[PDB]
Amino acid sequence: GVKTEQEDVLAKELEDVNKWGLHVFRIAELSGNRPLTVIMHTIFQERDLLKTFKIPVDTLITYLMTLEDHYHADVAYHNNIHAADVVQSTHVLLSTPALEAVFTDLEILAAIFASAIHDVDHPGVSNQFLINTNSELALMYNDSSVLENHHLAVGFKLLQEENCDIFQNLTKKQRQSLRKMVIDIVLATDMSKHMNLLADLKTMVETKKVTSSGVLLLDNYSDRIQVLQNMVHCADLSNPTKPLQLYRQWTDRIMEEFFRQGDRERERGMEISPMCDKHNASVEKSQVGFIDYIVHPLWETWADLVHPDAQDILDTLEDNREWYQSTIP
Ligand SMILES: CC1(C)CC(=O)N(CC(=O)N2CCC(N3N=C(c4ccc(OC(F)F)c(OC(F)F)c4)[C@H]4CC=CC[C@H]4C3=O)CC2)C(=O)C1
Ligand SMILES: [Mg+2]
Ligand code: NI
Ligand SMILES: [Zn+2]
Protein backbone atom coordinates (compact mmCIF):
# COMPACT_ATOMS: atom_id res chain seq x y z
CA GLY A 1 0.00 0.00 0.00
CA VAL A 2 3.08 2.29 -0.34
CA LYS A 3 4.18 4.20 -3.50
CA THR A 4 6.92 2.75 -5.71
CA GLU A 5 10.03 4.88 -5.93
CA GLN A 6 9.09 6.33 -9.32
CA GLU A 7 5.62 7.16 -7.94
CA ASP A 8 7.38 8.96 -5.06
CA VAL A 9 9.58 11.06 -7.33
CA LEU A 10 6.44 11.93 -9.37
CA ALA A 11 4.50 12.88 -6.19
CA LYS A 12 7.38 15.17 -5.27
CA GLU A 13 7.30 16.95 -8.67
CA LEU A 14 3.49 17.27 -8.30
CA GLU A 15 4.02 19.41 -5.22
CA ASP A 16 4.75 22.19 -7.76
CA VAL A 17 1.18 21.84 -9.18
CA ASN A 18 0.13 25.26 -7.80
CA LYS A 19 3.18 26.98 -9.34
CA TRP A 20 3.62 28.66 -12.68
CA GLY A 21 6.68 26.88 -14.08
CA LEU A 22 5.89 23.33 -13.07
CA HIS A 23 8.24 20.89 -14.76
CA VAL A 24 5.58 19.36 -16.98
CA PHE A 25 7.96 17.55 -19.28
CA ARG A 26 9.57 15.88 -16.31
CA ILE A 27 6.10 14.93 -15.06
CA ALA A 28 5.41 13.36 -18.42
CA GLU A 29 8.57 11.24 -18.17
CA LEU A 30 8.02 10.25 -14.55
CA SER A 31 4.38 9.27 -15.10
CA GLY A 32 5.02 6.94 -18.07
CA ASN A 33 3.53 9.52 -20.40
CA ARG A 34 0.53 10.20 -18.21
CA PRO A 35 0.93 13.87 -17.34
CA LEU A 36 -2.69 14.75 -18.12
CA THR A 37 -4.07 11.94 -15.92
CA VAL A 38 -1.77 12.63 -12.93
CA ILE A 39 -2.11 16.42 -13.11
CA MET A 40 -5.93 16.22 -13.46
CA HIS A 41 -6.17 13.74 -10.65
CA THR A 42 -4.00 15.95 -8.37
CA ILE A 43 -6.06 19.03 -9.19
CA PHE A 44 -9.37 17.27 -8.68
CA GLN A 45 -8.22 16.02 -5.22
CA GLU A 46 -6.73 19.45 -4.34
CA ARG A 47 -10.02 21.20 -5.23
CA ASP A 48 -12.14 18.46 -3.63
CA LEU A 49 -14.01 18.01 -6.90
CA LEU A 50 -14.60 14.29 -6.44
CA LYS A 51 -16.60 14.83 -3.26
CA THR A 52 -18.35 17.91 -4.52
CA PHE A 53 -19.56 16.22 -7.75
CA LYS A 54 -19.76 12.68 -6.34
CA ILE A 55 -17.29 11.40 -8.93
CA PRO A 56 -16.26 7.81 -8.24
CA VAL A 57 -12.48 7.71 -8.22
CA ASP A 58 -12.19 4.63 -10.53
CA THR A 59 -14.50 6.37 -13.05
CA LEU A 60 -12.31 9.53 -12.93
CA ILE A 61 -9.15 7.57 -13.51
CA THR A 62 -10.71 5.51 -16.30
CA TYR A 63 -12.00 8.62 -18.06
CA LEU A 64 -8.71 10.46 -17.69
CA MET A 65 -6.64 7.57 -19.08
CA THR A 66 -9.08 7.21 -21.99
CA LEU A 67 -8.96 10.96 -22.70
CA GLU A 68 -5.17 11.03 -22.52
CA ASP A 69 -5.03 8.06 -24.95
CA HIS A 70 -7.05 10.01 -27.52
CA TYR A 71 -4.28 12.65 -27.70
CA HIS A 72 -1.65 11.62 -30.23
CA ALA A 73 1.84 10.84 -28.96
CA ASP A 74 3.10 11.30 -32.56
CA VAL A 75 2.06 14.99 -32.73
CA ALA A 76 4.90 17.17 -31.47
CA TYR A 77 2.97 20.04 -29.86
CA HIS A 78 -0.77 19.28 -29.73
CA ASN A 79 -0.45 16.24 -27.52
CA ASN A 80 -1.27 15.15 -23.97
CA ILE A 81 1.65 17.19 -22.51
CA HIS A 82 0.18 20.38 -23.99
CA ALA A 83 -3.27 19.40 -22.60
CA ALA A 84 -1.72 18.78 -19.16
CA ASP A 85 0.08 22.16 -19.33
CA VAL A 86 -3.06 24.08 -20.22
CA VAL A 87 -4.97 22.35 -17.40
CA GLN A 88 -2.25 23.18 -14.84
CA SER A 89 -1.93 26.76 -16.09
CA THR A 90 -5.68 27.25 -15.91
CA HIS A 91 -5.61 25.84 -12.39
CA VAL A 92 -2.98 28.44 -11.36
CA LEU A 93 -4.93 31.27 -13.02
CA LEU A 94 -8.11 30.24 -11.22
CA SER A 95 -6.26 30.58 -7.90
CA THR A 96 -5.30 34.21 -8.51
CA PRO A 97 -6.11 36.51 -5.45
CA ALA A 98 -8.27 38.81 -7.58
CA LEU A 99 -10.62 35.91 -8.25
CA GLU A 100 -10.79 34.45 -4.75
CA ALA A 101 -14.21 33.04 -4.18
CA VAL A 102 -15.56 34.55 -7.42
CA PHE A 103 -16.33 31.31 -9.37
CA THR A 104 -18.63 28.44 -8.35
CA ASP A 105 -17.43 24.83 -8.14
CA LEU A 106 -19.33 24.10 -11.41
CA GLU A 107 -17.57 26.96 -13.18
CA ILE A 108 -14.25 25.74 -11.85
CA LEU A 109 -15.05 22.20 -13.06
CA ALA A 110 -15.99 23.64 -16.45
CA ALA A 111 -12.75 25.54 -16.87
CA ILE A 112 -10.56 22.62 -15.83
CA PHE A 113 -12.54 19.97 -17.84
CA ALA A 114 -12.51 22.29 -20.85
CA SER A 115 -8.73 22.66 -20.55
CA ALA A 116 -8.30 18.94 -20.36
CA ILE A 117 -10.29 18.14 -23.51
CA HIS A 118 -9.54 21.29 -25.46
CA ASP A 119 -7.18 19.76 -28.08
CA VAL A 120 -8.07 16.06 -27.91
CA ASP A 121 -7.42 14.04 -31.06
CA HIS A 122 -5.60 16.96 -32.66
CA PRO A 123 -4.02 15.76 -35.98
CA GLY A 124 -1.19 18.35 -35.84
CA VAL A 125 -2.40 20.58 -38.67
CA SER A 126 -4.40 23.77 -38.84
CA ASN A 127 -8.08 24.38 -39.52
CA GLN A 128 -7.15 25.97 -42.83
CA PHE A 129 -5.14 22.90 -43.84
CA LEU A 130 -8.08 20.63 -43.04
CA ILE A 131 -10.39 22.85 -45.04
CA ASN A 132 -8.05 23.09 -48.06
CA THR A 133 -7.45 19.29 -48.16
CA ASN A 134 -11.24 18.55 -48.15
CA SER A 135 -10.70 16.50 -44.97
CA GLU A 136 -13.59 14.66 -43.40
CA LEU A 137 -13.37 16.86 -40.28
CA ALA A 138 -13.80 19.97 -42.34
CA LEU A 139 -16.76 18.49 -44.14
CA MET A 140 -18.34 17.38 -40.92
CA TYR A 141 -18.14 20.80 -39.34
CA ASN A 142 -18.83 22.93 -42.40
CA ASP A 143 -15.41 24.53 -42.24
CA SER A 144 -16.33 26.32 -39.00
CA SER A 145 -13.96 25.98 -35.96
CA VAL A 146 -13.27 22.52 -37.33
CA LEU A 147 -10.73 21.30 -34.80
CA GLU A 148 -12.39 22.92 -31.79
CA ASN A 149 -15.77 21.35 -32.65
CA HIS A 150 -14.02 18.00 -32.96
CA HIS A 151 -12.18 18.36 -29.63
CA LEU A 152 -15.52 18.99 -27.93
CA ALA A 153 -17.30 16.11 -29.61
CA VAL A 154 -14.57 13.64 -28.71
CA GLY A 155 -14.14 14.88 -25.15
CA PHE A 156 -17.90 14.48 -24.51
CA LYS A 157 -18.26 11.23 -26.45
CA LEU A 158 -15.59 9.57 -24.36
CA LEU A 159 -17.86 9.90 -21.29
CA GLN A 160 -19.90 7.04 -22.86
CA GLU A 161 -17.08 4.53 -22.73
CA GLU A 162 -17.11 1.80 -20.06
CA ASN A 163 -16.94 3.34 -16.56
CA CYS A 164 -16.01 6.77 -18.06
CA ASP A 165 -19.06 8.86 -17.11
CA ILE A 166 -17.55 11.20 -14.55
CA PHE A 167 -20.69 13.33 -14.53
CA GLN A 168 -23.05 10.43 -13.83
CA ASN A 169 -24.13 11.90 -10.42
CA LEU A 170 -24.74 15.46 -11.61
CA THR A 171 -28.33 16.58 -12.01
CA LYS A 172 -29.58 17.46 -15.48
CA LYS A 173 -29.47 21.16 -14.57
CA GLN A 174 -25.82 20.89 -13.48
CA ARG A 175 -24.94 18.92 -16.68
CA GLN A 176 -26.62 21.37 -18.99
CA SER A 177 -24.90 24.33 -17.39
CA LEU A 178 -21.56 22.53 -17.36
CA ARG A 179 -21.89 21.48 -20.99
CA LYS A 180 -22.76 24.96 -22.16
CA MET A 181 -19.80 26.51 -20.37
CA VAL A 182 -17.39 23.87 -21.65
CA ILE A 183 -18.57 24.39 -25.21
CA ASP A 184 -18.29 28.20 -24.88
CA ILE A 185 -14.76 27.87 -23.49
CA VAL A 186 -13.32 25.37 -26.05
CA LEU A 187 -14.80 27.23 -29.00
CA ALA A 188 -13.05 30.38 -27.69
CA THR A 189 -9.67 28.64 -28.12
CA ASP A 190 -9.96 28.98 -31.94
CA MET A 191 -7.43 31.76 -32.73
CA SER A 192 -9.87 33.27 -35.20
CA LYS A 193 -11.78 34.44 -32.07
CA HIS A 194 -8.74 36.03 -30.42
CA MET A 195 -9.35 39.68 -31.47
CA ASN A 196 -12.98 39.57 -30.31
CA LEU A 197 -12.08 37.96 -27.00
CA LEU A 198 -9.34 40.49 -26.41
CA ALA A 199 -11.65 43.42 -27.34
CA ASP A 200 -14.17 42.17 -24.80
CA LEU A 201 -11.52 41.60 -22.15
CA LYS A 202 -10.33 45.23 -22.71
CA THR A 203 -13.89 46.53 -22.32
CA MET A 204 -14.15 44.65 -19.12
CA VAL A 205 -10.89 46.13 -17.77
CA GLU A 206 -12.11 49.63 -18.73
CA THR A 207 -15.41 49.11 -16.84
CA LYS A 208 -13.85 47.01 -14.02
CA LYS A 209 -15.71 46.69 -10.72
CA VAL A 210 -14.23 45.24 -7.59
CA THR A 211 -16.04 44.23 -4.39
CA SER A 212 -15.96 41.35 -1.94
CA SER A 213 -12.60 42.10 -0.23
CA GLY A 214 -11.24 43.53 -3.52
CA VAL A 215 -12.08 40.67 -5.90
CA LEU A 216 -13.71 41.06 -9.29
CA LEU A 217 -17.41 41.60 -9.61
CA LEU A 218 -18.93 39.47 -12.35
CA ASP A 219 -22.69 39.55 -12.08
CA ASN A 220 -24.01 38.07 -15.32
CA TYR A 221 -23.25 34.95 -17.46
CA SER A 222 -21.81 36.97 -20.30
CA ASP A 223 -19.09 38.52 -18.10
CA ARG A 224 -18.45 35.34 -16.11
CA ILE A 225 -18.01 33.18 -19.24
CA GLN A 226 -15.87 35.86 -20.97
CA VAL A 227 -13.47 35.79 -18.06
CA LEU A 228 -13.28 32.00 -18.13
CA GLN A 229 -12.87 31.96 -21.90
CA ASN A 230 -10.01 34.48 -21.73
CA MET A 231 -8.52 32.58 -18.78
CA VAL A 232 -8.25 29.31 -20.73
CA HIS A 233 -7.18 31.23 -23.83
CA CYS A 234 -4.34 32.77 -21.67
CA ALA A 235 -3.38 29.32 -20.55
CA ASP A 236 -3.36 28.12 -24.17
CA LEU A 237 -1.10 31.11 -25.05
CA SER A 238 1.02 30.75 -21.89
CA ASN A 239 4.19 29.15 -23.32
CA PRO A 240 6.14 32.47 -23.75
CA THR A 241 5.31 33.40 -20.13
CA LYS A 242 7.05 30.40 -18.70
CA PRO A 243 10.70 29.92 -17.79
CA LEU A 244 12.87 29.83 -20.86
CA GLN A 245 13.74 26.17 -20.59
CA LEU A 246 10.02 25.31 -20.81
CA TYR A 247 9.25 27.95 -23.43
CA ARG A 248 12.01 26.78 -25.71
CA GLN A 249 10.76 23.22 -25.73
CA TRP A 250 7.32 24.43 -26.63
CA THR A 251 8.81 26.52 -29.43
CA ASP A 252 10.77 23.53 -30.75
CA ARG A 253 7.59 21.45 -30.68
CA ILE A 254 5.28 23.98 -32.37
CA MET A 255 7.95 24.61 -35.04
CA GLU A 256 8.25 20.92 -35.72
CA GLU A 257 4.52 20.70 -36.16
CA PHE A 258 4.38 23.80 -38.34
CA PHE A 259 7.28 22.68 -40.54
CA ARG A 260 5.71 19.23 -41.03
CA GLN A 261 2.54 20.93 -42.21
CA GLY A 262 4.58 23.13 -44.57
CA ASP A 263 6.32 20.06 -45.97
CA ARG A 264 2.92 18.56 -46.72
CA GLU A 265 1.71 21.82 -48.28
CA ARG A 266 4.91 22.06 -50.46
CA GLU A 267 4.70 18.40 -51.61
CA ARG A 268 1.09 18.98 -52.77
CA GLY A 269 1.67 22.33 -54.51
CA MET A 270 -0.28 24.38 -51.96
CA GLU A 271 0.66 27.79 -50.71
CA ILE A 272 2.82 27.24 -47.58
CA SER A 273 1.09 28.65 -44.47
CA PRO A 274 2.61 31.45 -42.29
CA MET A 275 5.78 30.05 -40.54
CA CYS A 276 5.43 26.51 -41.95
CA ASP A 277 8.34 26.99 -44.42
CA LYS A 278 11.49 25.50 -42.87
CA HIS A 279 13.56 26.90 -45.84
CA ASN A 280 12.31 30.46 -45.15
CA ALA A 281 12.03 30.50 -41.34
CA SER A 282 13.09 33.01 -38.80
CA VAL A 283 12.23 31.14 -35.56
CA GLU A 284 13.49 33.95 -33.31
CA LYS A 285 11.90 36.82 -35.17
CA SER A 286 8.60 34.85 -35.31
CA GLN A 287 8.58 34.44 -31.50
CA VAL A 288 9.18 38.13 -31.03
CA GLY A 289 6.34 38.90 -33.41
CA PHE A 290 4.03 36.32 -31.79
CA ILE A 291 4.78 37.99 -28.44
CA ASP A 292 4.36 41.56 -29.73
CA TYR A 293 1.14 41.10 -31.71
CA ILE A 294 -0.67 38.32 -29.80
CA VAL A 295 0.72 37.12 -26.45
CA HIS A 296 1.78 40.41 -24.81
CA PRO A 297 -1.37 42.29 -25.71
CA LEU A 298 -3.49 39.54 -24.18
CA TRP A 299 -1.39 39.00 -21.07
CA GLU A 300 -1.04 42.72 -20.49
CA THR A 301 -4.83 43.05 -20.50
CA TRP A 302 -5.22 39.99 -18.26
CA ALA A 303 -2.58 41.51 -15.89
CA ASP A 304 -4.66 44.70 -15.76
CA LEU A 305 -7.81 42.75 -14.93
CA VAL A 306 -6.16 40.98 -12.02
CA HIS A 307 -3.65 43.74 -11.07
CA PRO A 308 -1.14 43.19 -9.53
CA ASP A 309 -1.39 39.37 -9.38
CA ALA A 310 0.10 38.61 -12.81
CA GLN A 311 3.14 40.96 -12.62
CA ASP A 312 5.78 38.18 -12.38
CA ILE A 313 4.15 36.38 -15.32
CA LEU A 314 4.24 39.54 -17.43
CA ASP A 315 7.88 40.15 -16.35
CA THR A 316 8.86 36.65 -17.42
CA LEU A 317 7.15 37.20 -20.78
CA GLU A 318 9.02 40.53 -21.29
CA ASP A 319 12.33 38.87 -20.30
CA ASN A 320 11.77 36.02 -22.74
CA ARG A 321 10.88 38.47 -25.47
CA GLU A 322 14.25 40.26 -24.94
CA TRP A 323 16.04 36.99 -24.98
CA TYR A 324 14.57 35.96 -28.38
CA GLN A 325 15.13 39.56 -29.76
CA SER A 326 18.78 39.29 -28.72
CA THR A 327 19.40 36.07 -30.64
CA ILE A 328 18.27 37.48 -33.92
CA PRO A 329 21.06 37.54 -36.51
C1 LIG B 1 2.47 37.49 -35.94
C2 LIG B 1 3.73 36.87 -36.58
C3 LIG B 1 4.88 37.88 -36.55
C4 LIG B 1 4.12 35.60 -35.83
C5 LIG B 1 3.03 34.57 -35.86
O1 LIG B 1 2.76 33.91 -34.88
N1 LIG B 1 2.30 34.46 -37.07
C6 LIG B 1 1.24 33.44 -37.18
C7 LIG B 1 0.01 33.85 -36.39
O2 LIG B 1 0.01 34.94 -35.82
N2 LIG B 1 -0.95 32.91 -36.22
C8 LIG B 1 -1.96 33.06 -35.16
C9 LIG B 1 -1.64 32.05 -34.08
C10 LIG B 1 -1.68 30.65 -34.66
N3 LIG B 1 -1.47 29.63 -33.60
N4 LIG B 1 -0.26 29.69 -33.00
C11 LIG B 1 -0.05 28.98 -31.96
C12 LIG B 1 1.31 29.04 -31.37
C13 LIG B 1 1.65 28.45 -30.14
C14 LIG B 1 2.94 28.58 -29.63
C15 LIG B 1 3.92 29.29 -30.34
O3 LIG B 1 5.23 29.50 -29.98
C16 LIG B 1 5.72 29.15 -28.77
F1 LIG B 1 5.00 29.72 -27.76
F2 LIG B 1 5.56 27.83 -28.61
C17 LIG B 1 3.58 29.87 -31.59
O4 LIG B 1 4.62 30.56 -32.13
C18 LIG B 1 4.92 30.92 -33.40
F3 LIG B 1 3.92 30.80 -34.24
F4 LIG B 1 5.14 32.22 -33.39
C19 LIG B 1 2.29 29.72 -32.09
C20 LIG B 1 -1.17 28.21 -31.27
C21 LIG B 1 -1.92 29.14 -30.32
C22 LIG B 1 -3.31 28.71 -29.98
C23 LIG B 1 -3.93 27.73 -30.58
C24 LIG B 1 -3.31 26.91 -31.68
C25 LIG B 1 -2.10 27.61 -32.33
C26 LIG B 1 -2.44 28.70 -33.32
O5 LIG B 1 -3.53 28.76 -33.88
C27 LIG B 1 -0.73 30.51 -35.85
C28 LIG B 1 -1.03 31.60 -36.87
C29 LIG B 1 2.51 35.28 -38.19
O6 LIG B 1 1.95 35.05 -39.25
C30 LIG B 1 3.46 36.44 -38.03
MG1 LIG C 1 -6.66 24.17 -30.02
NI1 NI D 1 -1.34 9.61 -34.06
ZN1 LIG E 1 -4.22 24.23 -27.23
From Swiss-Prot:
What changing D119N does, per the record, is: Decreased 3',5'-cyclic-AMP phosphodiesterase activity. Loss of Mg2(+)-binding
GO CC terms, sorted:
apical plasma membrane; calcium channel complex; centrosome; cilium; cytosol; membrane; nuclear membrane; nucleoplasm
The molecular function terms of the Gene Ontology recorded here are: 3',5'-cyclic-AMP phosphodiesterase activity; 3',5'-cyclic-GMP phosphodiesterase activity; 3',5'-cyclic-nucleotide phosphodiesterase activity; ATPase binding; beta-2 adrenergic receptor binding; calcium channel regulator activity; cAMP binding; enzyme binding
Q: How is it modified after translation?
A: Long isoforms that share a conserved PKA phosphorylation site in the N-terminus are activated by PKA through phosphorylation. Isoform 3 and isoform 7 are activated by phosphorylation (in vitro), but not isoform 6. Sumoylation of long isoforms by PIAS4 augments their activation by PKA phosphorylation and represses their inhibition by ERK phosphorylation.
What is the annotated tissue distribution of the protein whose record heads this document? Expressed in colonic epithelial cells (at protein level). Widespread; most abundant in skeletal muscle.
Query: Where along the chain is Mn(2+) bound?
Result: D119
Positions of the catalytic residues: H78
Indicate which residues the UniProt annotation says bind 3',5'-cyclic AMP.
Answer: H78, Q287, F290
Localization per Swiss-Prot or TrEMBL = Apical cell membrane; Cytoplasm; Membrane; Cytoplasm, Cytoskeleton
> For binding Zn(2+) 2, which residues are annotated in this chain's numbering?
D119
Which residues are involved in binding AMP?
H78, D119, D236, N239, Q287, F290
Please provide the Gene Ontology terms (biological process) for this protein.
Answer: adrenergic receptor signaling pathway; cAMP catabolic process; cAMP-mediated signaling; cellular response to cAMP; cellular response to epinephrine stimulus; establishment of endothelial barrier; negative regulation of adenylate cyclase-activating G protein-coupled receptor signaling pathway; negative regulation of heart contraction
**Residues bound to Zn(2+) 1:** H82, H118, D119, D236
Please list the residues that bind Mg(2+).
D119
Domain named PDEase: residues: 2-329
Assembly notes? Homodimer for the long isoforms. Isoforms with truncated N-termini are monomeric. Isoform 3 is part of a ternary complex containing PRKAR2A, PRKAR2B and AKAP9. Interacts with PDE4DIP. Identified in a complex composed of RYR1, PDE4D, PKA, FKBP1A and protein phosphatase 1 (PP1). Isoform 5, isoform N3 and isoform 12 bind RACK1 via their unique N-terminus. Binds ARRB2. Interacts (via N-terminal region) with SHANK2 (via proline-rich region); the interaction is increased in a PKA-dependent manner.
Function as written in the Swiss-Prot or TrEMBL entry: Hydrolyzes the second messenger cAMP, which is a key regulator of many important physiological processes.
Q: Which disease is it linked to?
A: Genetic variations in PDE4D might be associated with susceptibility to stroke. PubMed:17006457 states that association with stroke has to be considered with caution.
Name of the molecule in the record: 3',5'-cyclic-AMP phosphodiesterase 4D
User: What gene name is listed for this protein?
Assistant: PDE4D
